[PDB]
Amino acid sequence: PKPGDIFEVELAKNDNSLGISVTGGVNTSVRHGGIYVKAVIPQGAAESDGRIHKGDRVLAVNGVSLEGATHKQAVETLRNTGQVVHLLLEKGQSPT
């Protein structure tokens, strides 16, 4: 994977949750995804299912533009998904 690159990833629910711990807060249309996974929830489609790791960022959650989505709006959106979660993420920079 390359930096600042775009790619779609389809994952099938397992524990009734996408299995991704995202944090941040409000946004003023400054960051595309406007989100950044600080931690992971090893209890569903993450630890075992794998695929998803720390450092990435969720931008499009099933046609849900995260341009200025609120922390609660994003998270709740990550869990409130369908049988399939075809969301697009982005290789976060994370310089430090």
CA gap 90, 60 in Å, rounded: 10
Q: Which residues are paired to 60 by β-bridges?
A: 65, 88
**Four-point Cα dihedral 73, 60, 21, 48, nearest 10:** 140
**Sequence spans of domains, the chain:** 5-91
CATH of 5-91, one of 2.40.160.20, 2.60.40.1180, 3.30.70.20, 2.30.42.10: 2.30.42.10
Give CA 37 to chain center in angstroms.
Answer: 7
SS in 3 state form for 57-87? EEEECCCCECCCCCHHHHHHHHHCCCCEEEE
Whether residue 25 contacts residue 93, with contact meaning beta carbons closer than 8 Å, is answered with no
Experimental approach was NMR
CA gap 28, 34 in Å, rounded: 9
Q: Which two tokens stand for residue 95?
A: 């310089």
**Entry field: residues in the chain:** 96
Amino acid residing at 8: E
Sorted by sequence, the CB contacts under 8 Å of residue 71 that are 6+ apart come out as 22, 23, 24, 25, 26, 35
What phi and psi, each to the nearest 5 degrees, are found at residue 79?
-85, -45
